[PDB]
Design a protein around this nucleic acid. Structure first.
Lengths: 48, 63, 79, 98
RNA sequence: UAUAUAGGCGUCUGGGGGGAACGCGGGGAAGUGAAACAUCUCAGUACCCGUAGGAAGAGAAAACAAAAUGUGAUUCCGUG
RNA sequence: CUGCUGUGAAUCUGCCGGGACCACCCGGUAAGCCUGAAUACUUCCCAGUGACCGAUAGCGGAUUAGUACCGUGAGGGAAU
RNA sequence: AGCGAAAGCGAGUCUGAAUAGGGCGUAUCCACACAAGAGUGUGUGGUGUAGUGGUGUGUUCUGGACCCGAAGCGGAGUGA
RNA sequence: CUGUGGGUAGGGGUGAAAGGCCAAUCAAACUCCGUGAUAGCUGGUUCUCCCCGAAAUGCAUUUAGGUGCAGCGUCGCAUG
RNA sequence: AAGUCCAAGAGUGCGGCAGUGAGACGGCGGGGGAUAAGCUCCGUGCGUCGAGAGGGAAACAGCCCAGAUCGCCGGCUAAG
RNA sequence: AAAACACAGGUCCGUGCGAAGUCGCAAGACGAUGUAUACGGACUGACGCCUGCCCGGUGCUGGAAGGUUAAGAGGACCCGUUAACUCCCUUUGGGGGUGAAGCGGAGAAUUUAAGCCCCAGUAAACGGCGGUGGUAACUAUAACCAUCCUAAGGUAGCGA
RNA sequence: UGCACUACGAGUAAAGAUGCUCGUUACGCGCGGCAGGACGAAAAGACCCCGGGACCUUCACUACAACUUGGUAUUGGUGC
RNA sequence: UCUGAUCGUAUUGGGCCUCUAACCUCGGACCGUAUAUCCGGUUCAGGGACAGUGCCUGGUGGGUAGUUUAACUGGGGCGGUUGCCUCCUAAAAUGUAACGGAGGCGCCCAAAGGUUCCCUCAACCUGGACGGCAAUCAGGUGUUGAGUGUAAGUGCACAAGGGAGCUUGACUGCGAGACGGACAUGUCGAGCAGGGACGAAAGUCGGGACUAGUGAUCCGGCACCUCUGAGUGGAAGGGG
């Protein structure tokens, strides 16, 4: 009902974060701006 | 008969230049989602083994 | 019979860790609490779990500001 | 044995890394020791260092610049640290890596 | 059952069994330890089988090492 | 490296070994052998040794000793 | 001679784009300065760092492991 | 019913079945060996005196009559 | 800030060696019990026994006095 | 020493005969110098009256079409190294993309057994063998009213 | 069979005393008897619990002995 | 010959009927052999390419074997419990037991996080339409009495409670001096690149008012890495 989701950077496709959403409340792949360390700037991060 | 070294201790502990026995902290292998990065950093790296366990760790490492 | 009780959490060892007059480094935990029984005072900060710690060094001083017990750090002049 | 609870040699993680079977390790001698052993300077090879008792007899010698160099030395070691080479040159000597 | 054979007759030559240890080749436990236990250990131990000899097995690299005009059968010690 | 089961190659532009495969590169020419010394042991014999025992010790056995005795037996097994 | 997981570098090293701080090391101690009073640092200059072989002793490791004691387990045999 | 001579043997025999009998022992005989099995258990552990001197708590524990570490003793150093 | 300070034979740190980890009763504070138990579980820079002789409670580990270095056929006392 | 075992009698099951079963690694043996009116096994236990219902669970005995289903030479694809292709720097050589022959991996489609799933039997196989409650069920009672659930509801007989 | 010139009552005590307290009783030593005590002897309680065994059971686990598949030795003219 | 019904050969396959030669027969007769229900040679008669066991393979498998079948526990069993959080026990620091008294927890968050800025909630009428105890938004009155996502507390009205704007501070990467700390887990993060807004300047944030919402190590997965790569090149594998 709330899986461990892995957010990856859209630019480098580095799996950077592991959060938990609710698959029901927010079924769509989560999109939030966080910075990959290797990129440096906050870039859009999406579920794997 | 040579004194055999404990393999597990040999693999989990190390000595520094001065001789301090160092170890990595537990709770950093898996189930890392909920752990705040502050806890993960606190657990990161090596620390000297506590004085209480220093004796038995040294005995296991020497023989 | 059988009692439905028998449980209790591990005591968290709360309370004041530095009392008024104790000199502390910049960062020492002055109090541990669940709410804000003590509110942070001058050069005292409040942490995530409501821990009062010293933002600056010096002696702890318990006071009251507007009917709220407060923990302050008064600087200690180097002699 | 620790009473049956997970021992300290099992509840702690194994230290990270590998030992690198092929690691090339150097017996090191510092330029301060070069000074102390050779106040006269001169050619200082692995044989000279071993004779003066600064490195093991059959080993890859490396030179490090920890002390201070004040004499002309023609050192010859498998490798030289940057500081060791710099001090060897500054003292009017030469650092032939061989 | 026919060239032809299993076998039968006669003669020489050997074998048989014992032996404490060591050898080689096979089979191969369990108590035990793992503070339980099965992997594992015990242990290739005990025991068992087959076999030698004064010794035996291995032995003269289609080897090992790594760029050294490297060593050059095996075995056995010390180290590693 | 090896056992049992199948499948099963070429003979030097061959084949192995380098802990899978290469312009590779090195080691070289297996699938048949015999080979002393260095090594292990002491039933037995000889000459010695002991900061070994000294008759409840030392071999079980200084005398009858694997005897007497016990057990159907394997076996156990003294005392002096 | 350490740091690190090694290309490794080396009185430094690891972490880190980030001379950002920390970890671990540079025996120890003394003086000089520069700094900051966040608990002291930074360099500079001094004396120069102490292991390692026997061996005693106490613990300890592998062995029977201070000594005695099971019921039971295994191997090979003996018994109707 | 019984004599004599036989046969069946240990995870096996035999059992008009009692788990009975299998050499005064049988819910797996006996002897030797593994073997000085192992036992968190019980017992025992031998001369003296001088100094100090506990603990029976905490945590954890396939743990609760065991053990690890801490607490408390002692002996060395260091601070004083 | 003093006191104790030719000592408490103190505190702290690091090492060698531990033993202990079954506690008992008494006073006080409490839980369980019936605000029974010589009950049970806690707290107590509380005590004593444990590990403590001596005097008193008659006898009587835990109560009161009092902590035995030895010898006196000396004296003063504690509880009583 | 019995109420237990056995027993003669019964029933079921197995067995086409170096049988089944058993001792054996095996050979061989017993069974049996026997032959289905014989053997082995299970239960019951003379004899007499009888052994009523149930094959749902589990065994056994047959198999209904499927599905699942190891061991293989079914070996797509993919992956390693590279003869070689292309291009960048850079030019007395290393940076990407494509990459045959091969040899070396991991290997999917497809592929057929038993068993399982599944259908029918089997209770002298292990085992099962209720309610209603509306009746006069007779108010000693066996059926009857017509009722839910399974596979069925304990039939005769006996019973402190 | 630790002792011994081994009383009784009420007590106290590890809560059932020949051995301790305060009393009571009792000349020493035997002999024949009886069995109330010495928590009498016997057998390191067969109960209970804990630890460990063994054997037994089973839709406990893991194995192993006892049935199907592939090709191997089985084998082909012309077959479908 | 390209989509393509049929091609005839040779190679190799699932299956059915078989020809006998493998192999089998405790079916017969012979001979070794005077003795012989042994066995093994010949032969005949049957099976037959099955069966048999060999290797590998699936199933059934207490038939046998080795084992495991927890502790606490006012004896043991039955029952109950075992980890975490909150309270009282708990003797005004910390801590403190019982099979003591009570409850919660193995979650919810993409907003219920961050940040800026605003607001206060209960309880009664002058009074109201269907409108009642309770709706309204009736503020008209009334002093912080409700509400905190969720147990309990400690807090919160200054708000931590109620609203909106933007946004993704789980600064993720690097990390202060410090501290909470039998051995195995927590509080601030002052600084750094890169952010978030609101804005306007100043400004604050390392998920939540706080303490539960979790599981060491070992083993392996999966991504990225300027790490190693058993002669060298890669590769496998390993490492971070």
């Amino acid at each position: 009902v709330r899986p461990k989701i892995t957010l990856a950077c859209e630019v480098c496709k580095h799996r950077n974060y592991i959060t938990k959403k609710n698959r029901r409340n927010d079924p769509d792949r989560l999109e939030i701006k966080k910075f990959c360390p290797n990129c440096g700037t906050h870039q859009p991060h999406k579920e794997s | 008969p040579k004194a055999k070294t404990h393999s597990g201790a040999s693999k989990r502990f190390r000595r520094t230049g001065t001789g301090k026995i160092v170890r990595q902290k537990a709770n950093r292998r898996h189930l890392l989602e909920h752990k705040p990065t502050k806890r993960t950093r606190r657990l990161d790296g090596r620390t000297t083994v506590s004085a209480a366990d220093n004796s038995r760790i040294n005995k296991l490492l020497n023989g | 019979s059988s009692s439905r009780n028998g449980r209790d959490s591990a005591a968290q060892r709360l309370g004041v860790k530095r009392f008024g007059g104790q000199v502390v480094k910049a960062g020492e935990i002055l109090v541990r609490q669940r709410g804000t029984h003590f509110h942070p005072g001058v050069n005292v900060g409040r942490g995530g779990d409501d821990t009062l710690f010293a933002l600056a060094p010096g002696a702890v001083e318990f006071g009251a500001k507007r009917g709220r017990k407060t923990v302050n750090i008064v600087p200690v002049a180097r002699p | 044995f620790e009473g049956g609870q997970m021992p300290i040699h099992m509840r702690l993680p194994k230290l990270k890394g590998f030992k690198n079977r092929f690691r090339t390790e150097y017996q090191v001698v510092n330029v301060g020791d070069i000074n102390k052993a050779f106040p006269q300077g001169g050619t200082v090879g692995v044989d000279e260092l071993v004779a003066k008792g600064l490195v093991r007899k059959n080993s890859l010698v490396k030179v490090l610049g920890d002390g201070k160099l004040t004499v002309k030395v023609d050192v010859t070691a498998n490798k030289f640290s940057g500081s060791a080479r710099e001090a060897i040159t500054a003292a009017g000597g030469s650092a032939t890596e061989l």
